[PDB]
Amino acid sequence: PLSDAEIQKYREEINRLDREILDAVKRRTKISQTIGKTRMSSGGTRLVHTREVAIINQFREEIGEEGPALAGILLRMGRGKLG
Amino acid sequence: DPLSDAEIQKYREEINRLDREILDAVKRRTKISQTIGKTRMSSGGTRLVHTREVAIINQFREEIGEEGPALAGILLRMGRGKLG
Amino acid sequence: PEGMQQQFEDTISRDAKQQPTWDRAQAENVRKILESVPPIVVAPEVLELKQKLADVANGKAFLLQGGDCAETFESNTEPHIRANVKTLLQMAVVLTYGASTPVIKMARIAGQYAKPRSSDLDGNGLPNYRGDIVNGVEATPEARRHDPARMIRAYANASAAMNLVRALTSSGTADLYRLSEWNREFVANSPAGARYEALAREIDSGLRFMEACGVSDESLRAADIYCSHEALLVDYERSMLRLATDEEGNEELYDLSAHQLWIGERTRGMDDFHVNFASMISNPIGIKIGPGITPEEAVAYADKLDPNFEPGRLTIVARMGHDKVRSVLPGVIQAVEASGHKVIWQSDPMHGNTFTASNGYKTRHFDKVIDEVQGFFEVHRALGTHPGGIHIEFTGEDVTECLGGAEDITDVDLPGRYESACDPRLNTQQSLELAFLVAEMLRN
Amino acid sequence: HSSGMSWTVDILPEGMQQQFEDTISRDAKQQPTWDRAQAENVRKILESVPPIVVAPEVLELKQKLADVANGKAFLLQGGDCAETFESNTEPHIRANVKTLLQMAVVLTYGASTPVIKMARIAGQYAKPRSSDLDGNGLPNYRGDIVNGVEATPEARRHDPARMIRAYANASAAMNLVRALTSSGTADLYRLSEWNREFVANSPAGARYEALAREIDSGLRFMEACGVSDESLRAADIYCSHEALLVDYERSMLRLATDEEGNEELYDLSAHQLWIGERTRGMDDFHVNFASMISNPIGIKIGPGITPEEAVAYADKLDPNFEPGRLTIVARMGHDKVRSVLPGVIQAVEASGHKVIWQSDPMHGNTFTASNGYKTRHFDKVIDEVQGFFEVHRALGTHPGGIHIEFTGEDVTECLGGAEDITDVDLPGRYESACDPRLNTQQSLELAFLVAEMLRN
Numbered sequence A: 001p002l003s004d005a006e007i008q009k010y011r012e013e014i015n016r017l018d019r020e021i022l023d024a025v026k027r028r029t030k031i032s033q034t035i036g037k038t039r040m041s042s043g044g045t046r047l048v049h050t051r052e053v054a055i056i057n058q059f060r061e062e063i064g065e066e067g068p069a070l071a072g073i074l075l076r077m078g079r080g081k082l083g
Numbered sequence B: 001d002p003l004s005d006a007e008i009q010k011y012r013e014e015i016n017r018l019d020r021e022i023l024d025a026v027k028r029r030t031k032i033s034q035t036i037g038k039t040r041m042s043s044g045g046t047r048l049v050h051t052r053e054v055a056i057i058n059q060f061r062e063e064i065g066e067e068g069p070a071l072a073g074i075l076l077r078m079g080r081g082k083l084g
Numbered sequence C: 001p002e003g004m005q006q007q008f009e010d011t012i013s014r015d016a017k018q019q020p021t022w023d024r025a026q027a028e029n030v031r032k033i034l035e036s037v038p039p040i041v042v043a044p045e046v047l048e049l050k051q052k053l054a055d056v057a058n059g060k061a062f063l064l065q066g067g068d069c070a071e072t073f074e075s076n077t078e079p080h081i082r083a084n085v086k087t088l089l090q091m092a093v094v095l096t097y098g099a100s101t102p103v104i105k106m107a108r109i110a111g112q113y114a115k116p117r118s119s120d121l122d123g124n125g126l127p128n129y130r131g132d133i134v135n136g137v138e139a140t141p142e143a144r145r146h147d148p149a150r151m152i153r154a155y156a157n158a159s160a161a162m163n164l165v166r167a168l169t170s171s172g173t174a175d176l177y178r179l180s181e182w183n184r185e186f187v188a189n190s191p192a193g194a195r196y197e198a199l200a201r202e203i204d205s206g207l208r209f210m211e212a213c214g215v216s217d218e219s220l221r222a223a224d225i226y227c228s229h230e231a232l233l234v235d236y237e238r239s240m241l242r243l244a245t246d247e248e249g250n251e252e253l254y255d256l257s258a259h260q261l262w263i264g265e266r267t268r269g270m271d272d273f274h275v276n277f278a279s280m281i282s283n284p285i286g287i288k289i290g291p292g293i294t295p296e297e298a299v300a301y302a303d304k305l306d307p308n309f310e311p312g313r314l315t316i317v318a319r320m321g322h323d324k325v326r327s328v329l330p331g332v333i334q335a336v337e338a339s340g341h342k343v344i345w346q347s348d349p350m351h352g353n354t355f356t357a358s359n360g361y362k363t364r365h366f367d368k369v370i371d372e373v374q375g376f377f378e379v380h381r382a383l384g385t386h387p388g389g390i391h392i393e394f395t396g397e398d399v400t401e402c403l404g405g406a407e408d409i410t411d412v413d414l415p416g417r418y419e420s421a422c423d424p425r426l427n428t429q430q431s432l433e434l435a436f437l438v439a440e441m442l443r444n
Numbered sequence D: 001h002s003s004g005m006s007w008t009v010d011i012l013p014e015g016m017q018q019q020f021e022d023t024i025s026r027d028a029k030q031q032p033t034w035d036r037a038q039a040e041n042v043r044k045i046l047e048s049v050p051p052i053v054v055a056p057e058v059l060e061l062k063q064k065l066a067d068v069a070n071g072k073a074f075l076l077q078g079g080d081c082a083e084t085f086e087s088n089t090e091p092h093i094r095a096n097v098k099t100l101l102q103m104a105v106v107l108t109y110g111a112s113t114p115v116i117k118m119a120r121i122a123g124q125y126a127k128p129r130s131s132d133l134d135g136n137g138l139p140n141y142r143g144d145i146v147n148g149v150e151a152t153p154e155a156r157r158h159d160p161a162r163m164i165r166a167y168a169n170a171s172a173a174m175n176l177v178r179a180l181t182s183s184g185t186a187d188l189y190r191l192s193e194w195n196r197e198f199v200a201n202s203p204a205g206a207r208y209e210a211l212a213r214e215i216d217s218g219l220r221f222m223e224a225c226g227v228s229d230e231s232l233r234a235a236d237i238y239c240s241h242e243a244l245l246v247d248y249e250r251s252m253l254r255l256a257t258d259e260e261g262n263e264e265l266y267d268l269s270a271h272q273l274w275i276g277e278r279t280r281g282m283d284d285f286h287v288n289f290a291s292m293i294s295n296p297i298g299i300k301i302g303p304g305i306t307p308e309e310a311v312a313y314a315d316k317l318d319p320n321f322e323p324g325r326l327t328i329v330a331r332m333g334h335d336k337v338r339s340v341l342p343g344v345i346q347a348v349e350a351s352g353h354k355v356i357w358q359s360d361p362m363h364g365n366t367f368t369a370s371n372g373y374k375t376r377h378f379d380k381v382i383d384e385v386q387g388f389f390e391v392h393r394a395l396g397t398h399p400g401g402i403h404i405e406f407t408g409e410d411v412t413e414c415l416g417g418a419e420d421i422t423d424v425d426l427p428g429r430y431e432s433a434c435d436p437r438l439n440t441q442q443s444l445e446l447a448f449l450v451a452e453m454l455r456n
């Protein structure tokens, strides 16, 4: 029907938003990795626990239930998986 | 020590703006997904479309690798709800 | 045979729809032969099943039922039976992880040889195929004749199938770690494997956790598969009735052609044979209800099929179509729960969602099959009641009968390997996918 | 011959005494200075008492540590830096036992292997000290087995009778450890309940949610699959401590003869013993004592160790090439672990020794803050284990275990964690007789994070 044509241009907009999320995740990942290299090249730790928790908790404050998982992904991409 | 400190404070506020952007993108995505869901279900169609979900998940993995599916999963669960 | 005899004469004195017209004296000779043969299952097994089904209805377990829409003698082979058995067990391990409860595993097998037809004859005066227990698939006058000797062939085939099912499940086919390796090579090979990766990884970590905790158990090497089929054909079903005497001394009447029997949607008249036969026997019973059911009609079935208020005794099988399950089921559930019966609520997301495609083939869209089970779970979550199980038609072979799934089967693909002698079945891939999605539904 | 010969037959050991005289005559760092007569007499008493562990337990541990060493299990060791007699109480021992059992559940899920559970307990009463004194020429506290905490001449006298106090406290502690672990404290489901509360109440709860849920589904899956909780209602906790005090460890030497007839010498003050950083001179008492006892052995190696030295210890302490006999405990600092360890691991692996590689991220990361309290930052403690793991993944070797100082008390001793402890928090509840321990929350947080390292 007419409602199928609308769905196609709503999906078209999701796609553009998916490109944006994905472009920004990449960029974010580059920057987190650099902070890592800059703290580590001067005898610092790979991970900073309070900074990690803060972002995770603020993501939950912002989107709810999935916040921690969303933040966990960005944290894993940016400082690597632990171990 | 003080020079590596100051720079990390700038990089962090720069991470924050990228997070604001990702968060704000996710929120509008999720409106649109829900809206698609209501439209399809109000006209006697299914809550979920599998082929469509599978393709996004597969796009996400092709673009960022390892974490691709988990990110797409978060967005799908935000869009159309947890299953069950 | 004193209280029972009154009730048996009443049952057999009633109309039964969907029967074959064959020489009755022949049918009666065939029944006398089958009344002496070893049963397909023994009564202690059925008693064990009923304890397990009580656990399902009380919200401590999940029923997984499925297999061929229609078994054929042609297809009753080691490879085909192993294939379905493997798939059922693989599904069950994923569903067990999602449910956090045991899964009772119930195969449509060893007797699903009869099918209901709308018209007895076709427009050119040829009798329709009613199943391999009545006549042949071959569309000729001779092959379509209703042959009561096929009851013996069905019994011989069912014996062999059930013998094999028992052999496979006691000799390593039901080993938990072997099943999980097959799931792992499903995920690694699916075009939608990335949809299931995380959940599969979680299960494996769970498996390896048991091993690390020092759980050495024969529990994990084997599993029980119960057989079921639609109790349709009067003569075969009554010839498999047997009296079994209990541990404490009670005589019960069982139909021992299967552990579980159900009543189809087209044979559930309150005044008719099938419902009254089901009331008589002490096997656990299922009943298919469609979109036209009323909450009152559902409560009348519960009173009659579960007269002693035995949790798990009755399974109500909702086959309503995805588009109606959210409207029709809630009221049915509330009425039956309020009437004090604790039934198993099961979804049959197959028979309410069939249609004929542009090319002529009957098919089902994976998304509509999923949406019905999804909806069924939504209704249960709202009401605070227990989703008891699912009933799905599938095969462990690479068929092209249902549309959708990870492989995106379309109309054009259907003629490739369409093999079912009746309804469209989920292929291996679709079945394994459905198990994962239903596991998420169970997880919420 | 065989049937004739069978009826005819029917009708201080010598090698050990060599090695034992060699060992006793070696120099011994970090000893007290007390009357030799009194000392001997106390050893005479302690030579006759029931041991703290029996030899077959030690043989069982050796089999488990061999699994660890071969990549099939993980070693969790930890507890108080220094036990004291005043604190050797039911509630405190219970507090630590639980914490360690709780950590072990999470680590087992993360390793996908068994975790061997070794408490610093039932004998950790001696400590090394830089000088014999130094405040005002008054003797330094060397632990409750040598002298008292109180800052007075009478309390600080080195007292040999404190070796009997220590044995008695050790005995009591092991008795309780055994009792708790067999009567419900080590029930897997009770412990998971305690982990579930930790997550629910942590200000960093969302950091652990998803692993905690996943573990939970793991547990519920076992029960769904029909697993009887026979294996799951109890567990073995092993004791360990630093073999430090000469007079005490020799007085607990016991001869043990096994089932195949073979005679061995055990120090039965503990299942496992280790040699400290400050006492590991290759010609000195401690290394040579550990070389002549059949107990599994640990050795602390700091950031000055070379690979050449690593190998030679391995040859001295594991001379019969027994997997898990010897555990190499790296305590290098978070900033040194990635530089030093690789070379150590490569030479040792190449020499055919199969040791347990263990991370002690506490003793290389200790510092003194503005207010004068010794402390350790959580992030630096975590980073040393994290780097230890990184090295192992690069070399393809097995990250064997961790050795951490913790308590089951809500102390304020180490900085960081979710509770965000800072300089100003430390004098709230600072209770350690010696080094800054992880508290209950920090200990559980660390188990979740080391669980993620294991899963990688």
Ligand SMILES: O=C(O)[C@@H]1C[C@]2(C(=O)O)C=C[C@@H](O)[C@@H](C2)O1
Pocket: A032, A033, A035, A036, A046, A047, A048, A049, A051, A052, A055, A074, A075, A078, A079, B012, B015
């Ligand atoms: O110090 C930091 O800020 C960076 C960035 C990081 C992130 O990815 O957001 C946040 C915390 C740290 O563990 C890592 C990862 O270093």
Ligand SMILES: O=C(O)[C@@H]1C[C@]2(C(=O)O)C=C[C@@H](O)[C@@H](C2)O1
Pocket: A011, A014, B033, B036, B037, B047, B048, B049, B050, B052, B053, B056, B075, B076, B079, B080
């Ligand atoms: O049909 C759709 O396009 C929408 C959007 C959606 C998403 O969130 O991306 C993608 C697929 C569907 O299952 C749901 C969720 O409806």
Ligand SMILES: N[C@@H](Cc1c[nH]c2ccccc12)C(=O)O
Pocket: C212, C213, C214, D101, D102, D104, D105, D108, D114, D115, D186, D187, D188, D191, D231, D232, D233, D234, D235, D236
């Ligand atoms: N006894 C098993 C399982 C177990 C019981 N209690 C435990 C406490 C922690 C870890 C595991 C356990 C083991 O130690 O492996």
Ligand SMILES: N[C@@H](Cc1c[nH]c2ccccc12)C(=O)O
Pocket: C089, C090, C092, C093, C096, C102, C103, C174, C175, C176, C179, C219, C220, C221, C222, C223, C224, D224, D225, D226
């Ligand atoms: N017998 C156990 C475990 C098990 C073995 N094989 C299985 C196959 C599927 C599900 C579970 C199992 C059970 O039924 O729970």
Ligand SMILES: [Mn+2]
Pocket: C069, C070, C351, C393, C422, C423
């Ligand atoms: Mn069918």
Ligand SMILES: [Mn+2]
Pocket: D081, D082, D405, D434, D435
């Ligand atoms: Mn210490």
